[PDB]
Structure formats: C-alpha cells, structure tokens
Amino acid sequence: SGAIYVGNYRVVNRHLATHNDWANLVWEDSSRDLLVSSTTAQGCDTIARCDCQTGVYYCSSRRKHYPVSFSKPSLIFVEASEYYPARYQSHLMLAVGHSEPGDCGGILRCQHGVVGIVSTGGNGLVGFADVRDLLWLDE
Ligand SMILES: COc1cccc(Cl)c1CC(=O)N1C[C@H](C(N)=O)[C@H]2CCC[C@H]21
Ligand SMILES: [Zn+2]
C-alpha cells in the first residue's frame, strides 16, 4: 500500500484504489496502473521533473529503503492478475531489487522529489509506475 499527496490530488495504484477514490475520480489509466483522486487537505509532496535513473524506494516487505538504478519509462509485459489480463503496462521503469505484491504503493524518490510508485515485481526485479510526466499534478 501507499499514495502520493500533491496539492489537491492523491495518486495511488489503480488496482488498490478505494470506493472514495473512485467517487472523487480526477483521472485513471488502466495501462499505467494509476488513479488520481481529489482531496480536501493540501498535499505537500514534491514531484520530480527530471530524467534521473538513480533513486531510493521504500520496501514494506523488508521495512527498509533501498538505493536503485532504474530504466527509462517504457512499455513492459506484465503477467495476468485478478485486476488485469496479460498486457503491456506503459510508463513503467524496472530495477533490480526486492519486492512482493503488498509492496505496491511504495515511493521511489531521487534528489528532485517523487519519481513514481511500486507497481510490479518478481524474480529479483521491481517495477515503478512513473509520475514525472504528469505535469498537471502541480496546477
Ligand atoms: C510488487 O509486485 C510484485 C512483486 C513480486 C511479485 C509479484 Cl507477482 C508482484 C505483483 C505484480 O507484479 N503486480 C503487477 C500488477 C500490474 N501492475 O499489472 C499488479 C496488480 C496485482 C499484482 C501486481
Ligand atoms: Zn531526479
């Protein structure tokens, strides 16, 4: 689990979104596993606007943060789940690191701010949904 709170928005994995998230829907994209809902309180997370390929993510299944090198956002094949059939998930970045399904929502940050959230993993890899291209999160 986990979310990004920026301005009047809450960013979460689309497969983990609540009934309240869907009742206050701003934007969702099944191909990215993202959903953004509106909030009453003012969020203070800073979104990174950069092309960093190094950062640190939070891994709940180890209660630890890990430094990682990660790939550029791209279309990557993802196994079927209770939420999606087998498909290419877009805007995804892979890194070598530990992850388990419940790790989804963990934040990946670089020196500029929030880069994305854990969305996929398996076999010593972890995949992050990018949020740096969503320029409107700041306006
Ligand atoms: C961090 O996730 C894992 C880590 C290790 C192993 C495994 Cl199988 C996972 C889960 C995982 O890959 N996915 C990818 C899905 C997707 N984004 O399409 C998500 C929906 C429900 C399962 C989630
Ligand atoms: Zn950066």
CA 45 to chain centre: 14
Whose tokens are 């320029």? That residue is 135
Please give all residues whose beta carbon lies within 6 A of any atom in ligand 1, as ranges.
15, 33, 78, 81, 83-84, 89, 99-101, 103-104, 118-122
Cα–ligand 2 centroid distance for 78 (angstroms): 26
3-state secondary structure (DSSP) of residue 10: strand
Cα–ligand 2 centroid distance for 57 (angstroms): 13
Pocket test for ligand 1, best of 33, 59, 81 (most atoms within 8 A of CB): 81
Which ligand 1 atom lies nearest to the CA of residue 127? 1
Cα–ligand 2 centroid distance for 94 (angstroms): 16
Domain ranges of the chain: 3-44, 45-139
Per the CB < 8 A criterion, the answer to whether 129 and 13 are in contact is: yes
SS3 content of the chain, % helix, strand, coil (to 5): 15, 55, 30
Tokens of 124: 């010593």
Residue 45 has what DSSP assignment?
Answer: P
Per the CB < 8 A criterion, the answer to whether 86 and 79 are in contact is: yes
Give catalytic residues, as residue numbers. 15, 33, 104
Q: Across the strands, what pairs with 70?
A: 95
Per the CB < 8 A criterion, the answer to whether 15 and 105 are in contact is: no
Resolution in A: 1.4
